[PDB]
Amino acid sequence: RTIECEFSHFAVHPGHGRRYVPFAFLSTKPVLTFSRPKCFALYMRKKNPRFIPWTRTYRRIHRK
């Protein structure tokens, strides 16, 4: 019952993260989830998850 993060794909156990509804559209989910404010402050800056060594997708690219 842990909705996985958006920008770093962490596990967000209930009551820890801070969700976010961008003024935009999404058929998938209108609300974005972020475990750490680092994960979000680095998303208004809008890096990509890959190219960031500690995120999860990087651990699908840098792991092979």
């Binding site: 209930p14 009551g15 993260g17 801070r18 969700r19 976010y20 509804v21 961008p22 003024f23 935009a24 559209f25 209108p30 609300v31």
Partner: protein, 128 residues
């Protein structure tokens, strides 16, 4: 009513997410607020406020009118324990009784404002 954190003190310029012509919602005063001393009347996510339009059509400008907050750029902790917030403040412009008044909303109306206004949810593209 809900335990929504307050975001929009009196004198805040909310923008209009309702295709009625207006662009701004300079918050005149919160409808329902019980006065406290030196405390600025602060709108919240579900609150209905009184407004003057500061930008948009003139057929509604120099006039005090109502509005319901759609979106809140201040993170309120949902009672389910999920702290959630928006890109931008937003409010529909509404009937003095409370009615939709304006073309269906161009934004993700929040849960705390739909189940306090059965006339907004029926015009909102998404609920969040």
């Amino acid at each position: 009513r809900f335990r929504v954190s307050v975001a929009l003190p009196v004198g805040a310029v909310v923008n209009c997410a309702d295709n009625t012509g207006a662009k701004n919602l300079y918050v005149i005063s919160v409808k329902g607020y019980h006065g406290r001393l030196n405390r600025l009347p602060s709108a919240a996510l579900g609150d209905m406020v009184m407004c003057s339009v500061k930008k948009g059509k003139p057929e509604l400008r120099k006039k005090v009118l109502n509005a319901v907050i759609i979106r809140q750029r201040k993170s309120w902790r949902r009672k389910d324990g999920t702290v959630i917030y928006f890109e931008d403040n937003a409010g529909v412009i509404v009937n003095p009784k409370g009615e939709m008044k304006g073309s269906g909303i161009a934004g993700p109306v929040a849960k705390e404002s739909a189940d306090l206004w059965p006339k907004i949810s029926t015009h909102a593209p998404a609920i969040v």
